[PDB]
Design an enzyme around this catalytic site. Structure first.
Site, short mmCIF file in Angstrom:
data_model
loop_
_atom_site.label_atom_id
_atom_site.label_comp_id
_atom_site.label_asym_id
_atom_site.label_seq_id
_atom_site.Cartn_x
_atom_site.Cartn_y
_atom_site.Cartn_z
N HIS A 195 0.80 -1.22 0.00
CA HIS A 195 0.00 0.00 0.00
C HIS A 195 0.83 1.27 0.00
O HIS A 195 0.30 2.34 -0.31
CB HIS A 195 -0.93 0.04 1.22
CG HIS A 195 -2.01 -1.01 1.20
ND1 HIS A 195 -2.89 -1.16 0.15
CD2 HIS A 195 -2.36 -1.94 2.12
CE1 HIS A 195 -3.73 -2.14 0.42
NE2 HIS A 195 -3.43 -2.63 1.61
N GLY B 60 -2.03 1.98 4.99
CA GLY B 60 -2.48 0.63 5.26
C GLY B 60 -1.44 -0.23 5.95
O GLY B 60 -1.14 -1.34 5.50
N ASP C 163 -3.07 -10.79 -2.23
CA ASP C 163 -3.58 -10.26 -0.97
C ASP C 163 -5.08 -10.00 -1.05
O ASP C 163 -5.63 -9.78 -2.13
CB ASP C 163 -2.85 -8.95 -0.65
CG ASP C 163 -3.03 -8.51 0.77
OD1 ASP C 163 -4.11 -7.95 1.10
OD2 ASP C 163 -2.08 -8.72 1.55
C1 LIG Z 1 -8.70 5.34 1.21
N1 LIG Z 1 -9.38 4.92 2.43
C2 LIG Z 1 -9.00 5.25 3.71
C3 LIG Z 1 -9.80 4.62 4.61
C4 LIG Z 1 -9.73 4.70 6.12
N2 LIG Z 1 -9.81 3.41 6.80
C5 LIG Z 1 -8.93 2.34 6.29
C6 LIG Z 1 -8.18 1.50 7.29
C7 LIG Z 1 -6.72 1.46 6.85
C8 LIG Z 1 -5.89 0.47 7.66
N3 LIG Z 1 -6.47 -0.88 7.61
C9 LIG Z 1 -5.90 -1.88 6.89
N4 LIG Z 1 -4.77 -1.59 6.22
C10 LIG Z 1 -4.21 -2.61 5.56
C11 LIG Z 1 -4.74 -3.89 5.53
C12 LIG Z 1 -4.17 -4.98 4.67
O1 LIG Z 1 -4.26 -6.16 4.99
N5 LIG Z 1 -3.63 -4.58 3.52
O2 LIG Z 1 -3.18 -5.52 2.60
C13 LIG Z 1 -5.90 -4.07 6.27
N6 LIG Z 1 -6.51 -3.08 6.94
C14 LIG Z 1 -7.86 -0.91 8.06
C15 LIG Z 1 -8.74 0.07 7.27
C16 LIG Z 1 -10.76 3.86 3.85
C17 LIG Z 1 -11.82 3.02 4.18
C18 LIG Z 1 -12.58 2.44 3.17
C19 LIG Z 1 -12.27 2.67 1.84
C20 LIG Z 1 -11.21 3.49 1.48
C21 LIG Z 1 -10.47 4.07 2.50
K LIG Z 2 -4.64 -8.32 -4.15
ZN LIG Z 3 -4.36 -7.25 3.00
#
Ligand SMILES: Cn1cc(CNCC2CCN(c3ncc(C(=O)NO)cn3)CC2)c2ccccc21
Ligand SMILES: [K+]
Ligand SMILES: [Zn+2]
Ligand SMILES: [K+]
EC number: 3.5.1.98
Length: 364
Positions: A130, A138, A165
């Site tokens: 990310h 992320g 992923d």
């Molecule tokens: C750009 N954008 C920013 C947001 C804010 N919330 C997002 C969090 C970010 C952090 N998070 C997150 N990061 C990485 C992973 C992973 O496994 N990446 O391979 C999983 N989970 C939870 C969700 C958001 C939510 C929904 C759609 C788009 C949006």
């Molecule tokens: K993927």
């Molecule tokens: Zn992931």
């Protein structure tokens, strides 16, 4: 022919401190070593990435900010808003050193591939897909997959990046969105409100990179057989249209049944079939991890896939080792998916595959 396994105790110890996956790197390595798989691989100590190696993709201002807040873990620095550091990507103490080590680990694997030391090089603690050139995102502070691809580009003219992923590999796709020399293929959940919100089937790249990005949006509850059918169908067209010279493969295990996110319904066997299809191309292949929040299931998955890479069949009984108790209550390698609805209507799947086959026509 023996695959390179990127590992050192110092490296695993650093990766063990990442916020969302405490001790996951030790679990993965310990399970692999308990099946003795490391004895069949060439173990290579990762180098730490230098500032200039990280700046092949990331901006100096981003790297310098990250280094500064990493010294004491300043998670209240007013400039962090510029750089994506905050609730989702906190400025942990030492995070810059951990990022440099992961970037260095993936670059080292890429360097082994271009030196002909192996055809397959593995960095299970990589896959931070990310991260952006000037922003963490992320849970990703550095885009080691991009750094790996750029290193491979020193020798290989066309690189295929495949991202299995659960989440869209947006940071890698963005880095190469404007070039035809790197094609990115991402299979991922695509749904309103699901992070990072990008990667619809109509996202195909930009400029000279138009039609050299491929996105396969998938719904909750997909299982091994349909996922592999989708993956084989897409990768077959990709291989024919793009003719890759090297492959970077991200294998985040947050697709696996039992993950906290609970979206897909995969087992390592289904991902293993996707991996086999890519390995039979017999190209230089850089293997990365990624997401995976059921720690024991991720170690199950990547140990099994390491077995796949070595052509070995592993005993079902989890061998006694340091984290044995994490594998209860059944203590076996296999993962049983649950019985829940598959939200992927077959007509929509065929619409997506046809769209992608049409997009790949424009590719030479
Ligand atoms: C750009 N954008 C920013 C947001 C804010 N919330 C997002 C969090 C970010 C952090 N998070 C997150 N990061 C990485 C992973 C992973 O496994 N990446 O391979 C999983 N989970 C939870 C969700 C958001 C939510 C929904 C759609 C788009 C949006
Ligand atoms: K993927
Ligand atoms: Zn992931
Ligand atoms: K591209």
């Amino acid at each position: 022919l023996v695959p390179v396994y990127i590992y050192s105790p110092e490296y695993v110890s650093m990766c063990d401190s990442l916020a969302k996956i405490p001790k996951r790197a030790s679990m993965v390595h310990s399970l692999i070593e308990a099946y003795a798989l490391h004895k069949q691989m060439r173990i290579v100590k990762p180098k730490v990435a230098s500032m200039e190696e990280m700046a092949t993709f990331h901006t100096d201002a981003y790297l310098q900010h990250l280094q500064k807040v990493s010294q004491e873990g300043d998670d209240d620095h007013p400039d962090s808003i510029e750089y994506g550091l905050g609730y989702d990507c906190p400025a942990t103490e030492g995070i810059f050193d951990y990022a440099a080590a992961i970037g260095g680990a993936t670059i080292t694997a890429a360097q082994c591939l271009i030196d002909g030391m192996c055809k397959v090089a593995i960095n299970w603690s990589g896959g931070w897909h990310h991260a952006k050139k000037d922003e963490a995102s992320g849970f990703c502070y550095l885009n080691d997959a991009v750094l790996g691809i750029l290193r491979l580009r020193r020798k290989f003219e066309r690189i295929l990046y495949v991202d299995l992923d659960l989440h869209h590999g947006d940071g890698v796709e963005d880095a190469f969105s404007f070039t035809s020399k790197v094609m990115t293929v991402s299979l991922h959940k695509f749904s309103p409100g699901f992070f990072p919100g990008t990667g619809d089937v109509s996202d195909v790249g930009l400029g000279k990179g138009r039609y050299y990005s491929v996105n396969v949006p998938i719904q909750d509850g997909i299982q091994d057989e349909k996922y592999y059918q989708i993956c084989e169908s897409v990768l077959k067209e990709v291989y024919q249209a793009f003719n890759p010279k090297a492959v970077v493969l991200q294998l985040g295990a947050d697709t696996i049944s039992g993950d906290r996110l609970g979206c897909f319904n995969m087992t390592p066997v289904g991902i293993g079939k996707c991996l086999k299809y890519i390995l039979q191309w017999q190209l230089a292949t850089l293997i990365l991890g990624g997401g995976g929040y059921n720690l024991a299931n991720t170690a199950r998955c990547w140990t099994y896939l390491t077995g796949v890479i070595l052509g070995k069949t592993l005993s079902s009984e989890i061998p006694d080792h340091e984290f044995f108790t994490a594998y209860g209550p059944d203590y076996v390698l296999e993962i049983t998916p649950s019985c829940r609805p598959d939200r992927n209507e077959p007509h929509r799947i065929q619409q997506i595959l046809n769209y992608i086959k049409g997009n790949l026509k424009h590719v030479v």
